[PDB]
Design an enzyme around this catalytic site. Structure first.
Site, PDB file in Angstrom:
ATOM      1  N   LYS A   1       0.359  78.429  24.588  1.00  0.00           N
ATOM      2  CA  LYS A   1       1.058  78.540  25.891  1.00  0.00           C
ATOM      3  C   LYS A   1       2.170  77.514  26.036  1.00  0.00           C
ATOM      4  CE  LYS A   1      -1.433  75.580  29.168  1.00  0.00           C
ATOM      5  NZ  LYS A   1      -2.773  75.182  28.623  1.00  0.00           N
TER       6      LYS A   1
ATOM      7  N   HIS B   1     -11.002  68.957  28.245  1.00  0.00           N
ATOM      8  CA  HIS B   1      -9.549  68.711  28.263  1.00  0.00           C
ATOM      9  C   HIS B   1      -9.269  67.612  29.268  1.00  0.00           C
ATOM     10  CE1 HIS B   1      -5.326  69.606  27.699  1.00  0.00           C
ATOM     11  NE2 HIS B   1      -5.188  69.724  29.002  1.00  0.00           N
TER      12      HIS B   1
ATOM     13  N   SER C   1      -2.874  66.501  30.622  1.00  0.00           N
ATOM     14  CA  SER C   1      -1.640  65.784  30.232  1.00  0.00           C
ATOM     15  C   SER C   1      -1.381  64.555  31.119  1.00  0.00           C
ATOM     16  CB  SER C   1      -0.419  66.707  30.248  1.00  0.00           C
ATOM     17  OG  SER C   1      -0.202  67.172  31.585  1.00  0.00           O
TER      18      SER C   1
ATOM     19  N   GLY D   1      -3.510  67.255  25.591  1.00  0.00           N
ATOM     20  CA  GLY D   1      -2.989  66.258  26.509  1.00  0.00           C
ATOM     21  C   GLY D   1      -2.272  65.134  25.794  1.00  0.00           C
TER      22      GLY D   1
ATOM     23  N   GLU E   1      -7.001  70.846  20.724  1.00  0.00           N
ATOM     24  CA  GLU E   1      -6.090  71.895  21.217  1.00  0.00           C
ATOM     25  C   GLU E   1      -4.748  71.270  21.614  1.00  0.00           C
ATOM     26  OE1 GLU E   1      -8.591  72.924  24.433  1.00  0.00           O
ATOM     27  OE2 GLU E   1      -9.842  74.358  23.354  1.00  0.00           O
TER      28      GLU E   1
ATOM     29  N   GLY F   1      -0.993  70.972  22.372  1.00  0.00           N
ATOM     30  CA  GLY F   1       0.199  71.798  22.573  1.00  0.00           C
ATOM     31  C   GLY F   1       1.441  70.940  22.484  1.00  0.00           C
TER      32      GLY F   1
ATOM     33  N   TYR G   1       6.667  72.673  37.537  1.00  0.00           N
ATOM     34  CA  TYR G   1       5.356  73.027  36.983  1.00  0.00           C
ATOM     35  C   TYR G   1       4.744  71.956  36.112  1.00  0.00           C
ATOM     36  CZ  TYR G   1       6.179  77.865  38.487  1.00  0.00           C
ATOM     37  OH  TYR G   1       6.447  79.002  39.211  1.00  0.00           O
TER      38      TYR G   1
ATOM     39  N   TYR H   1       6.588  73.363  27.513  1.00  0.00           N
ATOM     40  CA  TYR H   1       6.522  73.829  28.912  1.00  0.00           C
ATOM     41  C   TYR H   1       7.927  73.917  29.504  1.00  0.00           C
ATOM     42  CZ  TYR H   1       1.727  72.781  27.919  1.00  0.00           C
ATOM     43  OH  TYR H   1       0.518  72.803  27.313  1.00  0.00           O
TER      44      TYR H   1
HETATM   45  C1  LIG Z   1      -2.785  74.022  27.929  1.00  0.00           C
HETATM   46  C2  LIG Z   1      -4.015  73.645  27.235  1.00  0.00           C
HETATM   47  C3  LIG Z   1      -3.975  72.769  26.151  1.00  0.00           C
HETATM   48  C4  LIG Z   1      -2.681  72.176  25.701  1.00  0.00           C
HETATM   49  O1  LIG Z   1      -2.341  71.046  26.531  1.00  0.00           O
HETATM   50  P1  LIG Z   1      -1.176  69.996  26.034  1.00  0.00           P
HETATM   51  O2  LIG Z   1      -1.079  69.046  27.199  1.00  0.00           O
HETATM   52  O3  LIG Z   1       0.132  70.751  25.820  1.00  0.00           O
HETATM   53  O4  LIG Z   1      -1.687  69.331  24.814  1.00  0.00           O
HETATM   54  C5  LIG Z   1      -5.134  72.417  25.547  1.00  0.00           C
HETATM   55  N1  LIG Z   1      -6.330  72.934  25.917  1.00  0.00           N
HETATM   56  C6  LIG Z   1      -6.412  73.787  26.964  1.00  0.00           C
HETATM   57  C7  LIG Z   1      -7.759  74.323  27.375  1.00  0.00           C
HETATM   58  C8  LIG Z   1      -5.253  74.169  27.652  1.00  0.00           C
HETATM   59  O5  LIG Z   1      -5.331  75.035  28.679  1.00  0.00           O
END
Ligand SMILES: *Cc1c(COP(=O)(O)O)cnc(C)c1O
Ligand SMILES: *Cc1c(COP(=O)(O)O)cnc(C)c1O
Lengths: 402, 401
Positions: free
Chosen positions: B69, B188, B191, B228, B265, B267, B310, B368
């Protein structure tokens, strides 16, 4: 393609009835994506209403509010103009057969290549509010007919020190003199009171200020004829300040400052007014949590703040969930969008009966500044729009085409 | 530099001794005597490979599953897929994207705790077995639509998602009653996290839920530490400070001899610094207060700068050429192209006097930004030019083989 598909609305059926029918028809399946019902007949009802309330004012629909091809086609057949702000909006309107004289390029701050696009397609009327804009027009569209956009005060704006658009009266005088020096034709004045208008007297002040700039135009040697009173009119009855209260204040000001014998041509740029109430959104509860605090609920639905409910962040929207018995218990509830973002919350707290996964929630008045600014963040696709129109509405549209 | 058909699968060579900044300069110079001055990105796929090397060194026990995402660019997903990452997908469309690039379902975690039934069914239909959850209603949906799924219980951290420890116990009991297999725990930190000790507490909470799962009869092996992590060095709490706190906690609560498989995870970590945005000044106003300027540029809050609304973004405009100490600066605002008074990207900054046709650069614009942009008001998404050096491609080959 669903974009040009229109469904018949039978006699004695409303858009609400059609919504209830579609919901019933998918009851025993998991085909429960969010969807809109868009009543094109409501747009024709808004047009009849406009003709009655503002008989001297030609409407130019603000495409950005909702650029649906069905909406633009319906309004074009009705004979409205269009307020376009970009090459893509001009392309959309022209692709539906609208001539360039029914377009106003009412973006005061335009990229040079987009000014050239307008020139190449015969769109002559554009707004401006700065000297740099005059320089760009002198280079890229020298035969343009310019409309000077003046400032309007919004005492409730979140940032009142920095106003994106609109020249003061003092600046307006300098702009008209500069346009004359560059041999650019200024043909009128525009203003936009803004969607946050709480006092219709704001329109009276703007009309008075526009008359002052018309007088300046006459002093500099222009032949001003075009008054553009902008947008900001409400799109539903669910507002404190209703359309006809505003128009009842506008019309005496137009008669006083811009009498018909002057040869003035009055236009406006309504966006939300035409479309807000025409769209109703149905979302499905896709997930549910119960939180003991006494019993409270968290409902997750399949549209959210990156989709249709971007209006909460961009359009200062306050959304009202509606159920698709008086004695049943209500619980404190929050409503969340589908994305994996803790910010994707649609309603912080409201009172609802206990609902279940597969139940529908309805949101009325979702036509304006919703689908136009939605993204597919996180992979969630835009809700399908089902366009409906009655036979009598179609016949009314035919009368306008003649 | 011009794209060759569609930008999505077009990649340009980055010659020896050239950086993404050099390419940006070349593109700007190439359009200097014309009006084709649309906003554009330079996206250095080699920066994503550098991030991957850095991840392997900093978190050697943790398999990264890229959070699609954050930036669903096909070029990014293909680069990371060739690198051998997993993917965290939250929707049917993201699963379709990853599978379309050839990634098998065992490299996908469907880490969305609150999933539409038809999207659960899509995952089942395509062999994506691992999904997260944090509620009893979710267990009911899985029992009906994906009964052989391998579920990962998402716990709360220091609130849209995450079960408390008390709720986690009940969910494990309920999963057992429904004959659904729970194989691990995810969290999680978010961020917005300023304290890496949040990770220590989350890892301790995850160990507690693992122990609860062992009590009820589950074989728990999957620990997912979420995302994050920062994507640039322009932050107070840097990646390696976080990882330096995470690794001792992993060794304390989840030693390697236990058989645990640890994933994360990330991103923004993988992509933030890979993208630099160039916007053109399309309009200009002078306001006497004493001189101040208002600059209008051709990307804004409905496009790439939606991150301001956002993603809590604080954007920093940069000039192509670092100015002289002597050059006069003025108080300046920067506005997007739309006919919306809210479309402002910088309220007040100090800039030399700038002119229409000048460029402003924004670094660290990979995460993002384009993922949530719209074409509101008809303004089109900026072209992305993907670049990769020969040595970066060689590194990608080493990872792929
Ligand atoms: C969006 C998301 C991430 C990615 O977050 P980042 O801050 O970009 O690393 C990781 N895990 C879950 C469950 C998410 O929804
Ligand atoms: C957006 C816009 C409108 C339409 O505003 P509504 O509140 O939808 O009526 C009108 N005029 C201008 C110049 C606009 O930019």
């Amino acid at each position: 393609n669903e974009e040009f598909d229109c469904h018949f609305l039978d006699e004695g059926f409303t858009a609400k009835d059609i919504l209830d029918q579609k919901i019933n028809e998918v009851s025993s399946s998991d085909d429960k994506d969010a969807f809109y019902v868009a009543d094109l007949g409501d747009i024709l009802k808004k047009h009849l209403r406009w003709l009655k309330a503002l008989p001297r004012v030609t409407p130019f629909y603000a495409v950005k509010c909702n650029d649906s091809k069905a909406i633009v086609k319906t309004l074009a057949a009705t004979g409205t103009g269009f307020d376009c702000a970009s090459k893509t909006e001009i392309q959309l309107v022209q692709s539906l057969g609208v001539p360039p004289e029914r377009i106003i390029y009412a973006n005061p701050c335009k990229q040079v290549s987009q000014i050239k696009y307008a020139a190449n397609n015969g769109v002559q009327m554009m707004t401006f509010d700065s000297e740099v804009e005059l320089m760009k027009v002198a280079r890229a569209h020298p035969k343009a007919k310019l409309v000077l956009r003046i400032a309007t005060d919004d005492s409730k704006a979140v940032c009142r020190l920095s106003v994106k658009f609109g020249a003061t009266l003092r600046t307006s005088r300098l702009l008209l003199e500069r346009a004359k020096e560059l041999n650019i034709d200024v043909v009128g004045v525009s203003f936009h009171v803004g969607s946050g208008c709480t006092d219709p007297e704001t329109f009276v002040q703007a009309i008075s200020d526009a008359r002052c700039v018309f007088d300046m135009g006459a002093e500099v040697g222009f032949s001003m004829y075009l008054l553009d009173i902008g947008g900001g009119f409400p799109g539903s009855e669910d507002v404190k300040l209703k359309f006809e209260e505003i128009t009842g204040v506008i019309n005496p000001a137009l008669d006083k400052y811009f009498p018909s014998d002057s040869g003035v041509r009055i236009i406006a740029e309504p966006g939300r007014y035409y479309v807000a109430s025409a769209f109703t959104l149905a979302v499905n509860i896709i997930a549910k949590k119960i939180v003991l605090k006494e019993q409270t609920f968290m409902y997750y639905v399949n549209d959210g703040v990156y989709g249709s409910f971007n209006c909460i962040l961009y359009d200062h929207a306050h959304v009202k969930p509606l159920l698709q018995k008086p004695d049943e218990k209500y619980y404190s509830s929050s409503i969340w969008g589908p994305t994996c973002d803790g910010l994707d919350r649609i309603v912080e707290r409201c009172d609802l009966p206990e609902m279940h996964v597969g139940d529908w929630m309805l949101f009325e008045n979702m036509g304006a500044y919703t689908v136009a600014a939605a993204s597919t963040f996180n992979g969630f696709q835009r809700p399908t729009i089902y366009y409906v129109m009655s036979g009598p509405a179609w016949q009314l549209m035919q009368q306008f085409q003649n």
